[PDB]
Amino acid sequence: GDTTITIVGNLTADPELRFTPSGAAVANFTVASTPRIYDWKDGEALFLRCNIWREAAENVAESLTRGARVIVSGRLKQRSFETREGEKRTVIEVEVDEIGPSLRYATAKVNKA
Template identity: 70%
Template sequence: MAGETVITVVGNLTADPELRYTQNGLPVANFTIASTPRNFDRAANEWKDGEALFLRASVWREFAEHVAGSLTKGMRVMAQGRLRQRSYQDREGNQRTAIELEVDEIGPSLRYATAQVTRAASNGGGGGGGGQSRPAQQQQVSEEPWSTPGSSTSADAWSTPGSFGDDTPF
């Protein structure tokens, strides 16, 4: 959408994502990403940490359940989303403004770690929630993690070299 501020943040989770449900049963996960720049100080011949950015983030619906079931405190993540500004009144009656990240995509950084990805079973709700929440279910996928469920990997253009000739199959 025009005028939205889209950013990508790389940092570490400061705590496990907190999964809650709205009064309508809609899942939402909230968490904080700490991103600290590191610069090399040539004079001291060492790396120095800059000032950390602590950015509150949220995800909704089935996505929230996936995040809460997959990510934990301390994990280095990459998150992309839209900055949202909201105003509220604190307990003392002061007007406050908060800037938060509404996450569109998030995943573990593989710079210093490895990950095993499994496809989550769809609840058939089309992502709309439908007023009822179900816990995220994971299924072990016997095919490649990125293949279409129920498809045979032998039909995959990339699984058998030369099986589709020299032409791109799509």
């Protein structure tokens, strides 16, 4: 039913870990995905605002920092705004199902629980 995607990229900044009145934790961060080339590299670019919640949000929070190369699988969510202030605005966000630091150019010590 939903539209899902996988985006590989680096966090543009440390994950903002804020809490809701009810206590549940929410982690926000935008992944910036940037491509490859030939003969000379680099181009394209894609910045997707993401949000994970619950314990995954705190793990994201305590396990990721700026520049971190991540793998993110989630659901695209989009909202459509105004006209009574200007004229047609669209925004998009990714509800993260799973995310983890990528092991393509690095390592990590994974501690269970």
